[PDB]
């Protein structure tokens, strides 16, 4: 996975005195830059899935609309992290954004399962960022993470699990009637 | 097909100095008259399909309403072409309108496939009209065609393809439940 | 006249058990199909006259608008007859629509006189349909004809007669001022 | 005609590096300057006709108002061309504006015929500008011409033709009653 | 200057019995025609300055808007003079409109100074027209001039003088900051 | 430049029968995929500039807001191209998005100049796409490009040129007062 390769890169590759800087360690600055890159990658993956469901031989409108909304949300998350980096007096360092691993998604159920996997990966990354913050005695960063990311990740994971369960019980992926009716009643 | 017979008729059979005529070749006048005839034929075919779905042993209301709307649109297209012919100083020449080739359509899926075929034929005819216009150095006619016909044809073809795909995946034409639910949720 | 040729065709050429059919004779079914063809022919003639008055060397706007409205009305009549055919359990059979006999109409007065002639022909056809219905003891069809066609035909004929009289007394067709004044004050 | 003398002047007499210039040939710049001069000439001619119909021994108010409106429109066209010249990075070069060829117009019909002639001349000039633009592979200029000038020229020519036809059929120029009544109904 | 050449041309070159003419001398008619030509020339000069300030390497929006408004006002003045010529029973005689003397204006201050010069020239011309009117005992013409032109000229000259003074005291033309801020605060 | 490397890559690296495909050549499909990649790159560059002007030792709010708006517009352009690719029956192929070449922008004037350069590069790419479309006789694609991209590029280039000119005349980049006042009055 590209996600793993990005996440396990050393901190020394994510760095380029400010009058506002106070109690802000270099390791935290590098970790914030890495997290920015991960958020942009997630946005790109969601965009790819959305326009997959727009093809003339797939044709499920509400799936595409749902995934496009997810993409816009991921981009907002990245911009918020950049704002924090500027607030505490660090410097932003950017990198290339990788193409998504999958090119064809093959059904609604398969795409939902891939999305669940991606969300759990993002959650694990945020938990490691939090433990790094507690190791350096930085309560402002800890409070920022707790108040803006953790409960949202938990709710998103629960929603995706519910969707997967309902699609499995209805008889997908063999039954196209199931995916048609799920597109109409749950996502519409 | 009657469409092919009409479209491959020579230009000399579609002709009957105006104070407004300027840079308007005889071949273009004849081709416009032929295109008028084709649009009226398409309107007649759509009317036939619409009232097929109104029979007591078929009974799908939203299919009939959809096809009636298509018929009215084709007639509007023909009237716009007649207005252009009068604007540039040519003379309108009319011919008989042929009866449609099919008398029974047998299901919603089959009618959708026939409609897709007819739309692609109309698009091919318009492309030949455009290349004729460019061969004679007539930019006004080229701009008229580009701005009023091409993107509409592309969108109509895409919509019909989506409809055919959804009807196939649900299990039509053997499953009447599929066509009932498609009539309710997509066309209703 | 094409109208006469269409109207005097035998009933055997206008035919292709329904769960709803009751007291509905085959001769009536064939006669309804023939009447549908006649209504479509009348619509086509009115369209031709309308766009004749749009030419740059004629240029009478209100004449053209009047005739276009008549064309739309004739098409509505045809669709109502098709609906009745489906209501009583018959089957619709379509034929070619003939081109109009006249290509140039030469003045407003001449077009009004041709329209009066066409309306009287349609009225005669409807009267024969009514007597056919009474010969077979079908009161529903008789009531349909009486309530939807006869008084409308009478009012249309009276209006056209009034128009012809006024155009003659003003000095048409030699006086263009007359036709100009009729276009402004009566049809505008 | 002064129009012909202006239009057939060589491009070398219509020219005087910008940070915004891109894909903009010198020949096109000169042709735009020439077209500006032509538009201003047309405005001046319309002004002359308008105040001719204001004289005490002619006295047709609505003719004068109509021609004054045409004059204002021509001036707006010229200002739009000057704006385009500044947008693409060329330089404006101005010349003298010639007096109109006619000093007395003698009737409403004669003035309408002269106006039709002038509009057809302007249309021919715009068509030559378009072919020049296509010879140099400049799509922005082509789109500008198509979207702002061609259909307007066509509609104006059609309207003037209709006016001339109606004035001829009523008995002008010998009948003053005809011109009096035309002023009140059509132009008013 | 072209203005001087136009203004010093003899009256015999500005002439081509009306039922309304009374107490209206030929010299006054010719002088009115000459004044019409001068007003149109002033309109053309203002148009040139306006589109000079629209260039991409000058870029001062409010200067351009101000000068365009002046151009429209000059054209209104000319139309009012033509109306008077028709009211008193004279005949309008038109001539060529000369191109402006300056092609590049080089700054806001220089353009303001040129405009002040032009307005004083127009005022001198109007004063000579008034003395001509008093020499022939024509009180209506005198009252027309006094009530529609003199106070407007005085106010315009005062405004332009104020603008020039403010631009000089701020440090123009060497300081671009001065012209930027004057564009924002005084003309905006 | 990364832009040049992306734009000069061969068409064979940008490709992976549809029921809707008609008159759509493989070369055009590959060129559309390449253009999508270029639009996403431009969005990323604008995002980088925007958050550069948010730093505590730069602190110009309206510059940052302006560049963020540009970034959102570029992303909308890319999504529109993806929609077209699906409409005509091709298949989307994605690639990595490159990091921007510049990491520090050093002033408002320098950033404006870099933006002007980038916009001219995008315009050149679109012109080559148009000539490719005309070489294959595809009028729908030509009309799409003309109606959605060319005039917008021209207006954007003109605006950026005006901004650069005004910043130079005020005395930037040495005068911080100039950039402060430009941030307040022009972008605010």
Q: Rg (Cα) of chain E, in Å, rounded?
A: 19
Secondary structure class of A172 (helix, strand, coil): coil
Cβ atoms of C177 and D178 closer than 8 Å: yes
Secondary structure class of F97 (helix, strand, coil): strand
Q: Any binding-site annotation on D119?
A: yes
Structure tokens at D50: 């308008």
Q: How far apart are the first and last CA of chain E?
A: 32
State which residue of chain B sits closest to F137, comparing Cα positions: B131
Q: How far apart are the first and last CA of chain C?
A: 32
Contact yes or no for D83 and E20 at CB 8 A: no
Q: Any binding-site annotation on A77?
A: yes
Question: What's CA E49's distance to the chain center, in Å?
Answer: 13
How crowded is residue A158: how many other Cβ atoms within 10 Å of its Cβ? 10
* Largest distance between two CA atoms of chain F: 63
Chains F and D touch (3+ CB pairs under 8 A): yes
Which residue from C57, C177, C184 is facing D165, i.e. has the nearest CB? C57
Chain A nearest-CA distance from B147, in A, is 24
CA distances from E157 to A15, E71, E118 (A): 65, 16, 10
* Largest distance between two CA atoms of chain A: 63
Chains F and E touch (3+ CB pairs under 8 A): yes
How crowded is residue A83: how many other Cβ atoms within 10 Å of its Cβ? 11
Rounded Cα–Cα distance for residues D51 and D58 (Å): 10
Helical segments of C15-107, H only = 26-52, 61-88
Contact yes or no for B100 and C94 at CB 8 A: yes
State which residue of chain E sits closest to D99, comparing Cα positions: E96
Q: Any binding-site annotation on C29?
A: no
Chain A positions in Cβ-Cβ contact with residue B181 (cut-off 8 Å): 180-181
Chain A nearest-CA distance from B165, in A, is 6
Rounded Cα–Cα distance for residues A14 and A94 (Å): 8
Rounded Cα–Cα distance for residues F188 and A40 (Å): 30
Chain C positions in Cβ-Cβ contact with residue D162 (cut-off 8 Å): 56, 59
CA atoms within 13 A on the CB side of A93: 14
Phi, psi of F19 (to 5 degrees): -70, -15
Cβ atoms of A163 and A152 closer than 8 Å: no
- Identify the experimental approach: cryo-EM
Which residue from B22, B87, B143 is facing D123, i.e. has the nearest CB? B22
Rounded Cα–Cα distance for residues D48 and D69 (Å): 12
Rounded Cα–Cα distance for residues F112 and F52 (Å): 13
Q: Which residues, listed in sequence order, are joined to residue B44 by a DSSP beta bridge? A: none
Rounded Cα–Cα distance for residues D133 and D122 (Å): 17
Secondary structure class of A119 (helix, strand, coil): helix
Q: Per-residue b/e over F44-55, b at no fewer than 16 CB within 10 Å?
A: bbbbbbbbbbbb
Which residue from B146, B157, B158 is facing F139, i.e. has the nearest CB? B146
CB–CB contacts below 8 A, C to D? 26
Residue whose C-alpha is closest to residue B40's, from B86, B1, B3, B91 = B3
- What's the count of helices (H) and strands (E) in chain E, helices before strands? 7, 0
Mutation test of the interface with chain B: which of D121, D151, D152, D156, choosing the one with the most B Cβ atoms within 10 A?
A: D151
Chain E residues touching chain F at CB-CB below 8 Å: 56-59, 176-177, 179-181, 184
Chain C positions in Cβ-Cβ contact with residue D161 (cut-off 8 Å): 56-57, 59
Residue whose C-alpha is closest to residue F50's, from A38, A33, A84, A82 = A82
Count Cβ atoms within 10 A of the Cβ of residue B131 and give its class: 0-12 exposed, 13-18 middle, 19 or more buried. exposed
State which residue of chain B sits closest to F147, comparing Cα positions: B147
Which residue from F19, F23, F142 is facing B161, i.e. has the nearest CB? F19
DSSP state of E136: T
Helical segments of chain B, H only = 2-7, 26-52, 61-88, 108-135, 139-145, 151-170, 176-185
Between vectors from CA B77 to CA B76 and to CA B79, what angle results, nearest 5°? 65
Chain D positions in Cβ-Cβ contact with residue E55 (cut-off 8 Å): 86
Residue whose C-alpha is closest to residue A129's, from A24, A30, A12, A14 = A30
| Omega before C173 within 30 of 0, i.e. cis | yes
Q: Rg (Cα) of chain F, in Å, rounded?
A: 19
Cβ atoms of E84 and E144 closer than 8 Å: yes
Chains A and F touch (3+ CB pairs under 8 A): yes
Contact yes or no for D87 and F131 at CB 8 A: no
Which residue from D166, D178, D185 is facing C59, i.e. has the nearest CB? D166
Contact yes or no for D56 and E92 at CB 8 A: no
Structure tokens at A73: 């949300």
Range list of β-strands (E), chain E = none
Structure tokens at D133: 């633009």
Q: Any binding-site annotation on B174?
A: no
Residue whose C-alpha is closest to residue C13's, from C36, C31, C1, C40 = C31
What DSSP element (H or E) covers E180?
Answer: helix E176-185
State which residue of chain F sits closest to D138, comparing Cα positions: F127
CB–CB contacts below 8 A, E to F? 25
Count Cβ atoms within 10 A of the Cβ of residue C120 and give its class: 0-12 exposed, 13-18 middle, 19 or more buried. middle
CA atoms within 13 A on the CB side of F50: 17
Only one residue has tokens 């004669």, namely D110
Rounded Cα–Cα distance for residues F147 and F84 (Å): 13
DSSP state of F136: T
Chain C residues touching chain D at CB-CB below 8 Å: 56-59, 176-177, 179-180, 184
Which residue from A57, A59, A177 is facing B171, i.e. has the nearest CB? A177
Contact yes or no for D116 and B87 at CB 8 A: no
- For residue E185, what are the contacts with CB-CB under 8 A and spacing of at least 6? none
Question: What's CA D54's distance to the chain center, in Å?
Answer: 22
Rounded Cα–Cα distance for residues A111 and A64 (Å): 11
Between vectors from CA B160 to CA B154 and to CA B161, what angle results, nearest 5°? 90
Cβ atoms of C72 and C20 closer than 8 Å: no
Chain D positions in Cβ-Cβ contact with residue E72 (cut-off 8 Å): none
How crowded is residue B19: how many other Cβ atoms within 10 Å of its Cβ? 16
Chains E and C touch (3+ CB pairs under 8 A): no
How crowded is residue C125: how many other Cβ atoms within 10 Å of its Cβ? 17
Rounded Cα–Cα distance for residues A127 and A154 (Å): 12
Contact yes or no for E96 and D96 at CB 8 A: yes
Q: Rg (Cα) of chain B, in Å, rounded?
A: 19
State which residue of chain F sits closest to E54, comparing Cα positions: F162
Secondary structure class of D109 (helix, strand, coil): helix
Rounded Cα–Cα distance for residues F146 and D144 (Å): 10
State which residue of chain C sits closest to B55, comparing Cα positions: C86
Residue whose C-alpha is closest to residue A87's, from A28, A132, A14 = A28
Q: Per-residue b/e over F79-100, b at no fewer than 16 CB within 10 Å?
A: bebbebbbbbbbebbbbebbbb
Residue whose C-alpha is closest to residue B92's, from F61, E136, C53 = C53
Cβ atoms of C81 and C126 closer than 8 Å: no
Residue whose C-alpha is closest to residue A91's, from A39, A144, A24, A148 = A24
Rounded Cα–Cα distance for residues C107 and C63 (Å): 10
Q: Any binding-site annotation on C39?
A: yes
Cβ atoms of C17 and C66 closer than 8 Å: no
Structure tokens at D132: 């020049």
Residue whose C-alpha is closest to residue C16's, from B65, B109, B52, B107 = B52
CA distances from F19 to A18, C148, F85, F88, F138 (A): 61, 46, 14, 10, 19
Cβ atoms of D44 and D99 closer than 8 Å: yes
């Amino acid at each position: 996975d590209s996600f793993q390769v990005i996440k396990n890169s050393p901190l020394s590759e994510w760095l380029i005195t400010s009058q506002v800087r106070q109690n802000y360690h270099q390791d935290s600055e590098a970790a914030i830059n890495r997290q920015i890159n991960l958020e942009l990658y997630a946005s790109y993956v969601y965009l790819s899935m959305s326009y997959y469901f727009d093809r003339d031989d797939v044709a499920l409108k509400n799936f595409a609309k749902y995934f496009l909304h997810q993409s816009h949300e991921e981009r907002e998350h990245a911009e918020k992290l950049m704002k924090l980096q500027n607030q505490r007096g660090g410097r932003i360092f950017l990198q290339d954004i990788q193409k998504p691993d999958c090119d064809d998604w093959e059904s609604g159920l398969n795409a939902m399962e891939c999305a669940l996997h991606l969300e759990k990966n993002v959650n694990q990354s945020l938990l490691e960022l939090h433990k790094l913050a507690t190791d350096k005695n930085d309560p402002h960063l800890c409070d920022f993470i707790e108040t803006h990311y953790l409960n949202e990740q938990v709710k998103a994971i629960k929603e995706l699990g519910d969707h997967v369960t309902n699609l499995r019980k209805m008889g997908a992926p063999e039954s196209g009637l199931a995916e048609y009716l799920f597109d109409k009643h749950t996502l519409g």
